[PDB]
């Protein structure tokens, strides 16, 4: 089964062919499951979700995965990114223009490396991560986070969500989500595709 082939923890994973379904890794065995009508698999929550929250899933089209405009639909910067549904594909973003790429046979996209690579022992790691709470609740007073902690003007990690960042601006505090599918890289202080590193997938494996 795919779960043990990739060295995946138990949990939910995208179906690469139908974004109305998903792969449930239970007891170390893969089961293809269907989302309820009106919901599709949300790659960022690892759960079925109201289809309006997942625009890259066009559940009315015969082939519903439509990442064809994702750099512009989600505002991803330039570079290579994991494919949200398919471990053997990836995305090239240039100036808002999307390129959907595929690795050679027997090869899988390694997001950390930024390239396709042969199957090893524990891969497709970009699908292994812990989503933030749904919704993310900020404590009363978080509007003073930047001031109270004397944070410098600029970008900071959001300590409540790995999908988000804090912006400190004249001692004012804002938090903002990364582009959907991107997560906050606390070492580079940018939103990028390293969900595995950014959202605690390392501890799951
Ligand atoms: O970009 C898209 O999806 C992203 C998301 O888009 C919104 O959700 C929808 O647009 C949406 C639309 C629907 O029709 C629907 O049925 C639904 O359930 C949600 C926001 O989600 C909301 O539902 C929402 C929630 C609220 O509590 C609001 O007060 C609100 O006005 C909208 C927003 O998410 C947020 O803005 C957001 C902000 C937070 O502070 C936060 O904690 C959070 O969880 C979400 C998020 O955007 C970002 O997170 C975001 C932020 C950036 O700074 C950035 O650079 C970027 O590229 C993307 C998108 C684009 C399209 O063309 C679509 O047709 C579509 O359906 C979706």
Automatic annotation (TrEMBL):
Disulfide bonds: 3-25, 19-57, 35-48, 71-93, 87-124, 103-116, 146-168, 162-199, 178-191
Entry keyword set: Chitin-binding, Disulfide bond, Glycoprotein, Repeat, Signal
GO CC entries: extracellular region
PROSITE patterns from the UniProt entry: CHIT_BIND_II
InterPro entries to which the protein is assigned, alphabetical: Chitin-bd_dom, Chitin-bd_dom_sf, Chitin_bind-dev_reg
One Pfam family matching this protein: CBM_14
Superkingdom, taxonomy of origin: Eukaryota
Location of the Chitin-binding type-2 domain: 1-59, 68-126, 143-201
Single Gene Ontology MF annotation: chitin binding
Residues annotated as transmembrane: none
PANTHER family reported for this sequence: CHITIN BINDING PERITROPHIN-A, CHITIN-BINDING TYPE-2 DOMAIN-CONTAINING PROTEIN-RELATED
Record-given protein name: 25 kDa polyphenol-binding protein
């Amino acid at each position: 089964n795919l779960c043990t082939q990739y060295g995946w923890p138990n949990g939910n994973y995208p179906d690469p062919y139908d974004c109305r379904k998903y792969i449930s890794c239970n007891g170390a065995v893969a089961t293809v499951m269907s989302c309820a009508l009106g919901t599709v698999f949300n790659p960022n929550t690892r759960n079925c979700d109201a289809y309006g929250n997942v625009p890259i899933c066009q559940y009315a089209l015969p082939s519903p995965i439509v990442v064809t405009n994702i750099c512009n639909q989600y505002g991803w910067g330039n570079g290579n990114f994991y494919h949200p549904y398919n471990c053997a594909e990836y995305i090239g973003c240039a100036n808002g223009l999307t390129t959907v790429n595929a690795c050679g046979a027997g090869q899988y996209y390694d997001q950390a490396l930024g390239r396709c690579a042969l199957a090893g022992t524990g891969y497709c790691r970009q699908y292994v991560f812990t989503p933030p709470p749904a919704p993310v609740v900020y404590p009363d007073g978080f509007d003073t986070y930047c001031s109270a902690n004397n944070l410098a003007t600029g970008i900071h990690p959001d300590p409540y969500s790995c999908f988000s960042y804090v912006e400190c601006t004249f001692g004012r505090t804002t938090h903002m989500p990364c582009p959907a599918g991107l997560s906050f890289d606390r070492s580079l202080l940018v939103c990028d595709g390293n969900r595995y590193q950014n959202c605690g997938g390392n501890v799951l494996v």
